[PDB]
Every structure is written in C-alpha cells, then in structure tokens.
C-alpha cells in the first residue's frame, strides 16, 4: 500500500486546487453589482454547502481520535446549524415583509421598495435615515442614489424601508421644489415604524 | 498500511470541514458594509491564497497521472496568475489615481473622492453618471446617497470619479437651489474625463 495512496493524494491535491480556484473566483468577482451570474452561482454554492458542511461536521463527530475532537465537531456543527437557521429566519421575515428576491442577498441588509408606475422597484440601502432625499435631474429619479426610471415632480406620496428585524419604516412625500429645468428635490420623511409586513 | 491512512483521512476530513466553515463565514458575513473585520480577514485570505493557489497548481503540474492533467494544471496556473496580475494592475492604477484604501476592495469598482473640509472622503459608487445629485436635508450632505458630514449650500466646486481603467471624470458645482430650511439641491455635472491620476 504505497502507490495508490500517493495517487489518491494527487487526486485530492487536484480537487483542492479546483476548490481553491472556485473560492478565488467567488471572492474576486461573484458580487451582485459585479456579476449577476456569479452572484447566483455563489448563492447556489452557499445553499448547497450549508447541509454539506453540517453533514461533514456530524461525520467528523461520529468518528474521533479522542473525546476532544468530538466536542469541537459538535460545537462547529451546532454553530453552523444556528447560522443556517438564523439566515433562513431572517430571509423569510424579509421576504414576508417585502416581495423581492433581494431578501436572500448576504451583501445587503436594508432594502427599498419604491413602486414607480405599478411595479415595486427594489434597491439596496446602506443606512437607515429619518429623511431620504431624491433628485430628478432632467427626468431621471435617483432616490438614495438609485436610478429608477423617468419621472417628474408628481411623485409617489409613500415609501417603505424594510430591515432584517422589524423596522418597517413608512415614508411620505414632502418638501417639493422645482427649478427652471425638469429637476426636483422632493424628499421622504419617516412617520411610522410599525405595522410590520403587509 | 491500513489504520494510519484512515487516521490521516479523518484529519483531512476535519481540516476540510474547518475550511468549509471559513468559506461559509466569508461568503455569509465578510463584507465591507457588513463587517469590516471580516472584510479585512477575507482580503487577507485572498492575498495569501493567491500564491498558495499558484504553488498548488504548479505542484499538481510537476506531478501527473498522464499528459492530460498536466496541461489542465498549467492552464489553471496561468489563468490564476493572469487574474492575480490583473487584479494588482487594476488596484495599483486605482491607488495611483486616488489616495484611498478602497482601491483593493473587489466589491467596488467605482469610487468617489469628495473632500469636504480638507479630508478626501471616499465613498463607493455603483454607476457612472453625467450628473450626480446632492441633497443637504438639514445640514447632512448626501452626495450619491452617501452621508459625508455637516455642510450647507456653499459646497466644493469640484468632484472626481475614478474607475478601474482610465475614466477620471471631473465634476463642478451647478444648479444650486435653497428652501425655507437648511436643505439644498446643488448637483455636479461632468466636464472632463481626461488628465488621469494626480
């Protein structure tokens, strides 16, 4: 038993090299705003490796060298299970509050749900603010620096900002100003953070 | 040669479980806007695994089962080397244009470099626009939906937007409007995309 163990070790080296390549590709280009295809690919790997990670930990727990590695394996298994269930709970609450597919993006925790002309456009947010500004700039609405389409000063008198846990802020139109062109200033100030979901 | 190969296989199973845990943690929480510590940790793993990935590929190339896997290993090694050198070239050009540490973030490709009161504040951008709006909202500048500090209508008459390859847009103040409060509308329109770097 000399050469076949070396051959399988070389196969495992090639396999771990391939997984390292996938890791590097996911960490370098797989992002929502960089490559949607690679973003979906990263989501698929996360969703399929969570149960595989749990199974690997329980397999490394059933076998052991001593009763030290077994406890560590149990701790890792329960930690990743807690993270898994917490992510599903947060995503399910998010998708119960809004109706967008951005609820499953780990990169984003705050989401906007502005409907422009009957379609609820969803854009990510970085911080929760009392008042959110909005400019038109010749008929190109840019709420929170997000291009949403073509509109003028006659906007929607309501906005909702969802978060991972509670925090369903409700906004309304206010402070409408016009210029010589087709631009504007009308912002949205929050007035209620209750009445969760829809 | 029966039991020691099984023991080392169990050790490798535990090791691959730990690496899977690190992969899941990096893909679930390690983001610039989610956890700065985990973002730096992910950057460190990327920077240390790029040469390790190259070394693993050249090691899997020097050994082979036949002259088929060697060519694949060479192709993977040269591909990851090209990606590595391209990332360094892009980051070095970015850090030669601006003077911010955001140049090494794979999540961001467009960066803003607005100096407010002598300090060049750097904020990420999603798209390159001809005109960028800016609101004040009671003394809280929000250029491109990025809170920068406390200021009023008397802003900086210049902005620069850097990109990965060339595209050093220069902006200037324009369309300044005031309201009854301490808010504003003054935006920035691009007038030059030349004179790269500083």
């Amino acid at each position: 038993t000399v050469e076949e163990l070396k051959k399988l070790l070389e196969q495992w080296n090639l396999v771990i090299g391939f997984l390292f390549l996938t890791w590097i590709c996911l960490l370098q280009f797989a992002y929502a705003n960089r490559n949607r295809f690679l973003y979906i690919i990263k989501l698929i790997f996360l969703w399929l490796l969570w149960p595989v990670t749990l199974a690997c930990f329980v397999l490394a727990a059933v076998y052991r060298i001593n009763w030290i590695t077994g406890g560590i394996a149990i701790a890792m298994a329960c930690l990743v299970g807690l993270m898994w269930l917490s992510y599903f709970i947060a995503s399910f609450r998010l998708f119960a509050r809004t109706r967008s597919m951005w609820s499953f993006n780990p990169e984003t925790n705050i989401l906007l749900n502005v409907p422009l002309h009957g379609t609820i456009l969803t854009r990510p947010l970085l911080e929760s603010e009392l008042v959110i500004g909005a400019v038109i700039l010749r008929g190109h609405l840019r709420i929170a620096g997000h291009h949403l389409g073509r509109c003028d000063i006659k906007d929607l008198p309501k906005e909702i900002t969802v978060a991972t846990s509670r925090t369903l802020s409700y906004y309304k139109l206010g402070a409408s100003q016009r210029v010589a062109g087709d631009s504007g200033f009308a912002a949205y100030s929050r007035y209620r953070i209750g009445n969760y979901k829809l | 040669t029966v039991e020691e190969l099984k023991k080392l296989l169990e050790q490798w199973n535990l090791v691959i479980g730990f690496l899977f845990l690190t992969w899941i943690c990096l893909l679930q929480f390690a983001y610039a806007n989610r956890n700065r510590f985990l973002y730096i940790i992910k950057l460190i793993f990327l920077w240390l695994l790029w040469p390790v990935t190259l070394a693993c590929f050249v090691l899997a190339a020097v050994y082979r089962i036949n002259w088929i896997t060697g060519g694949i290993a060479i192709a993977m090694a040269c591909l990851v080397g090209l990606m590595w050198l391209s990332y360094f070239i892009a980051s070095f050009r970015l850090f030669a244009r601006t003077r911010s540490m955001w140049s090494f973030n794979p999540e961001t490709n467009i960066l803003l470099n607005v100096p407010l009161h002598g300090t060049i504040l750097t904020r990420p951008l999603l798209e390159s626009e001809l005109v960028i709006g800016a609101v004040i909202l009671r003394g809280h500048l929000r250029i491109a939906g990025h809170h920068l500090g406390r200021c009023d209508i008397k802003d900086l008459p210049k902005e620069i937007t850097v990109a990965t390859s060339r595209t050093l847009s220069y902006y200037k103040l324009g369309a300044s409007q005031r309201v009854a409060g301490d808010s504003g509308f003054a935006a920035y329109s691009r007038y030059r995309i030349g004179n790269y770097k500083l």
Epitope: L130, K158, K172, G174, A175, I193 | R138, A180
Partner: antibody, heavy 120, light 112 residues
C-alpha cells in the same frame, strides 16, 4: 418663506361646535403634516392629532378622539379642526405647526394662535 | 403615555450666568437609532419656538447659545450666555410614541 395663518377669535355658546381654520403658503400643502397643539390659558401645551392632506390619514391622541375632528381640503390649501360638544374646559388657544421638510415629529413653524371662548 | 417632568418649575439666574433645565421622562425616550426629543421656547402672546430638535441639533435661525444634553432618560437644555430677551417658558416634548406629551413647563427669571 413658509408661513401659517389661522382665523381670528371664536366665541360659541356651550354645547355648540366650532371649526378652526389653518392654511399655509409658500409650500406644497398636501405633503406637510399638522399638529394642532392645544394650550389652556393657565396650563401648558397639549398635542391633539395629526393629519396628512395628501391621503387624508389622521392620527389622534385618545383624549381628543371624538372631541376633535381633523379635515383638510387640497383645493383650498386649508386645514380644518372641528370641536364638538364644547364646554368651559375647551376654552383654550390652538396652534397649528408643521416642519420644514414636511415631517410629523418636528414642529418648526407655528401659527399666531386662535383663541376660543366657551361662555354664555 | 410618557409623563414628562421638568425641574425646577421656576428658575432665576443672574444676567451673564448660565441656565440649566432638566426634563425627566417616564420610560425610555430614544427610539431605534433616534432620540425624538425637542425643546421649545414660548413667550407670552407668541407661539412656541423650537430651539433644539433630537436633543442634540440646533434649530436654524436660533443663536448658538442653546445646547442639549442627556441620553435616553434625561435631556438638558443649557444656555451659557443669558440675555434680557431669554425670558420665556421652556417646554420639553417627546415624539417617539403616538401621544406627543409635552413637559410641565419651566419659567425662566432674570436676577437684576
């Protein structure tokens, strides 16, 4: 320059009803909230309720729920408050306030005040 | 309903000194990431004038002599220079819950 102008003085017999007026100029009246703060001549301020003319949504305090009715008209750019079942306790001065940005939790600019006397 | 209490009910200060007004609260006032605490100044015959909003921000058009303090249980309005035009009644208001309860009111007096 935003401003708020109310009516003059109201003198109604007990048991009757009064309708106080508050209008604004220099801003979009339909996108701004009201506060309708009540202040007794001897006591301090007392919040009553809010109203949004854009959609007619009205919030109340609970003590004035039913005593005060908040109505607004977008065409005339005027907000109204109806006070029914008036007694001697209701004799107070009412102020309507709004924010610069149209918010509801901040009162920036107020009105000159409307004094209401309930006596025979 | 938050029961706001002000202490003292009446305060007298010499011209040139500083004034300190404290507004107690029944329960926690700070909301999720915000305070929603306001201070108003009302002269006799005039509507209340907002001085400090969110307990830490100066209102536009108000002199910089007014400042706020406290966090989530107490809020203090401080006037370092006091002038002859600073005589009024100061109120404290909370805007974190539906009932916008006001303070008891503090009448400021000048010792001359």
């Amino acid at each position: 320059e935003v401003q708020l102008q109310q009516s003059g003085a109201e003198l109604v017999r007990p048991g009757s009803s009064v309708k106080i007026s508050c209008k604004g100029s220099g801003y979009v009246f339909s996108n701004y909230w009201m506060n309708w703060v009540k202040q007794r001549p001897g006591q301090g301020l007392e919040w009553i309720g809010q109203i949004y003319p854009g959609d007619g949504d009205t919030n109340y305090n609970g003590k004035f729920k039913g005593k005060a009715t908040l109505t607004a008209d977008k065409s005339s750019s005027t907000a109204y408050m109806q006070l029914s079942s008036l007694t001697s306790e209701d004799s107070a001065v009412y102020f309507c306030a709004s924010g610069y940005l149209g918010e509801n939790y901040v009162m920036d600019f107020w009105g000159q005040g409307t004094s209401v006397t309930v006596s025979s | 309903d938050i029961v706001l209490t002000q202490s003292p009910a009446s305060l007298t200060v010499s011209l040139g000194q500083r004034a300190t007004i404290s507004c107690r609260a029944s329960e926690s006032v700070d909301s999720f990431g915000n305070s929603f605490m306001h201070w108003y100044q009302q002269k006799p015959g005039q509507p209340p004038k907002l001085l400090i909003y969110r307990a830490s921000n100066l209102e536009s058009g108000i002199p910089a002599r007014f400042s706020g303090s406290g966090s989530r249980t107490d809020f203090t309005l401080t006037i370092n220079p006091v002038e002859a035009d600073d005589v009024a009644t100061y109120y404290c208001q909370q805007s974190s819950e539906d009932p916008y309860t006001f303070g008891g009111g503090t009448k400021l007096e000048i010792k001359r």
